Amino acid sequence: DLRLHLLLNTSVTCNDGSPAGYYLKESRGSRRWLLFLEGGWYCFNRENCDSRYDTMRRLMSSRDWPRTRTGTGILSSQPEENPYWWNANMVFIPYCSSDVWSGASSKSEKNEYAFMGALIIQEVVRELLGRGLSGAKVLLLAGSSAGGTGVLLNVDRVAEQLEKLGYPAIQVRGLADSGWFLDNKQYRHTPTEAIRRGIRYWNGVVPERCRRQFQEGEEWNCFFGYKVYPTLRSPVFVVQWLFDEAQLTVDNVHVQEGLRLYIQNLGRELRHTLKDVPASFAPACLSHEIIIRSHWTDVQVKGTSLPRALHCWDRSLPLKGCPVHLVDSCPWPHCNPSCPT
Ligand SMILES: COc1ccc(CNC(=O)[C@@H]2CCCO2)cc1
């Protein structure tokens, strides 16, 4: 069980003004810290956010959160479930800002909702330092779906924050799961308009080198992995199914020659954007998310599991028998026999 702590700085809030927070399970014999960002889409205007508040309120408010949560997958403390980091200090950060972890805007008389995802990450890091993070050797910032995009937008800011506070020995790294999307043509028209409306609504913030490349009005580009990743300085491992279900939903895909070619070309383009990503894991499967799933140990690429590939990454920071770049070449979902059923 990880235990809930609401933030001590109560001006850092979920959408509705209630305090944000984190779940923690300490491991006093370990100098490794894992901070996981939850996902869950986003909202981009008043009417859209009001609908979310009616039926997805735990993603907008801490008022109903439970006092504990079970750690699963990479957050499990059991060696049989988590061969990678079972002895680490475990942190789960709930997503209650609906801004893909980018916002830095308070509620006020002109704003019905607060969007403070980027500040929530900073405040969690600051309060953990007094609970033992000051002694860390590695801080791994991990996240799934919207949280995986949030890793890409925030890992370098966390590195900078710890450096400016006087902790230069803590190595900050990122793990982005199912957060790597393509702004491609759809199979059928109903696109990027939602994320363009949202960044304005949230006052969203993107990494500094990427904002300087794309410049004003075009910062929405930095929410797409293949465009922001080359600008990052911290080490980042990318996990992405080649046929991701949230990608295909937005593409209006639910088999004739036209659809076959469409699907095969999506997998080829995805494989192409990962070619110069040295630490990555990308199986040829139709699925979404993996790292906090209990059976995340099961899938393999070229005979290597995801927990093994992450261990090889730790060692690298080429190794005989212990690879770190694992991308499937076969062109159709579930051409890899280890795909989840
Ligand atoms: C075809 O164009 C798209 C395909 C997939 C998505 C899904 N991803 C998101 O909506 C957010 C914003 C960007 C990163 O995550 C969005 C547009």
UniProtKB/Swiss-Prot annotation:
It catalyses: [Wnt protein]-O-(9Z)-hexadecenoyl-L-serine + H2O = [Wnt protein]-L-serine + (9Z)-hexadecenoate + H(+). The lineage of its organism: Eukaryota, Metazoa, Chordata, Craniata, Vertebrata. It comes from the Eukaryota. It is an enzyme of class 3 (hydrolase). GO terms for biological process: bone development; negative regulation of canonical Wnt signaling pathway; negative regulation of Wnt signaling pathway; protein depalmitoleylation; regulation of bone mineralization; Wnt signaling pathway. GO terms for cellular component: endoplasmic reticulum lumen; extracellular region. The active site is at residues 145, 244, 288. It is found in: Secreted. Its EC number is 3.1.1.98. Rarely expressed in adult normal tissues. Carboxylesterase that acts as a key negative regulator of the Wnt signaling pathway by specifically mediating depalmitoleoylation of WNT proteins. Serine palmitoleoylation of WNT proteins is required for efficient binding to frizzled receptors. Induction: Up-regulated in hepatocellular carcinoma (HCC) with high intracellular beta-catenin. The keyword Transmembrane helix does not apply. The chain holds residues 88 to 451 of 496 of the full protein. One of its GO terms (molecular function) is protein-containing complex destabilizing activity. This is Palmitoleoyl-protein carboxylesterase NOTUM. Belongs to the pectinacetylesterase family. Notum subfamily. The keyword Transferase does not apply. Glycans are attached at residue 9. Keywords: Glycoprotein, Hydrolase, Phosphoprotein, Secreted, Serine esterase, Signal, Wnt signaling pathway.
